[PDB]
Amino acid sequence: MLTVGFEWAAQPEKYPWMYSLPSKTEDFEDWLNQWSDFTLQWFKINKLHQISLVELMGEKPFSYLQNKSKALTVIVENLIARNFCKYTDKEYKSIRVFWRGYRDWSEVIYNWALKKGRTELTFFEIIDLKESPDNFHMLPKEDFKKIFNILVKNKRAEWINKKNMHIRILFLE
């Protein structure tokens, strides 16, 4: 490795070649690996699940890229191929970065409900929390629909009222 630990992200002026898109095939693959691995870490460490591409372009070190639009579209394409990312919709303006899948979210949420003594949960009560483990309270509404389905399917919950996204927690031990 030319550089280690994404040290190029910490001081962009010292590593300016990391901010130009390379044109040679070999160089471009290795650049893309570095930025794709970085961007996955940046979302995970910031416990962020989604964000518009224009907002991403205002954040260090993405803010130092030349051809921001073209550089992000190829990084995102790479994260999609590696099964860590999806665009949010057909307008291709925002991305959803899956550094954790729904099956793991469902255990994080179940364990938190047990540890906090809750016997029922609603979507509203979760999204109105002051804070939560790994910012689960910030997951998009569609992700909650799927997480609650998983909890019910897996016998860890049952529906009190599904049209209100309201579940009862089922106890095992």
Author numbering: 1 to 173
Q: Which of the paper's sentences describe this entry?
A:
The ESCRT machinery, comprising of multiple proteins and subcomplexes, is crucial for membrane remodelling in eukaryotic cells, in processes that include ubiquitin-mediated multivesicular body formation, membrane repair, cytokinetic abscission, and virus exit from host cells. Metagenome assemblies of the recently discovered Asgard archaea, the closest living relatives of eukaryotes, have revealed that homologues of the entire ubiquitylation cascade, ESCRT-III (and Vps4), and components of the ESCRT-I and ESCRT-II subcomplexes are all encoded by the genomes of these archaea.
Eukaryotic ESCRT-II forms a ‘Y-shaped’ hetero-tetrameric structure consisting of a Vps22/Vps36 stalk which binds two Vps25 subunits. Structural models for the Odinarchaeotal and Hemidallarchaeotal ESCRT-II subcomplex proteins generated using AlphaFold 274,75 identified potential tandem winged helix (WH) domains, which they likely share with their eukaryotic counterparts, Vps22 and Vps2579–81. In the case of Odinarchaeotal Vps25, while we were unable to crystallize the full-length soluble protein, high-quality crystals could be generated using an N-terminally truncated version (deleting N-terminal residues 1–58), which were then used to determine the structure at a resolution of 1.80 Å. Inspection of this structure revealed that the Asgard Vps25 core is composed of a tandem WH domain repeat, consistent with the predicted AlphaFold 2 model. B Superposition of the N- (blue) and C-terminal (wheat) Asgard Vps25 WH domains demonstrating their similarity. The alignment shown superimposes the N-terminal WH domains, only, and yields all-atom RMSD values against the Odin N-terminal WH domain of 0.7 Å and 1.1 Å for the yeast and human N-terminal WH domains, respectively. This suggests that all ESCRT-II proteins were initially derived from a single-WH domain protein progenitor, with Vps36 emerging during eukaryogenesis.
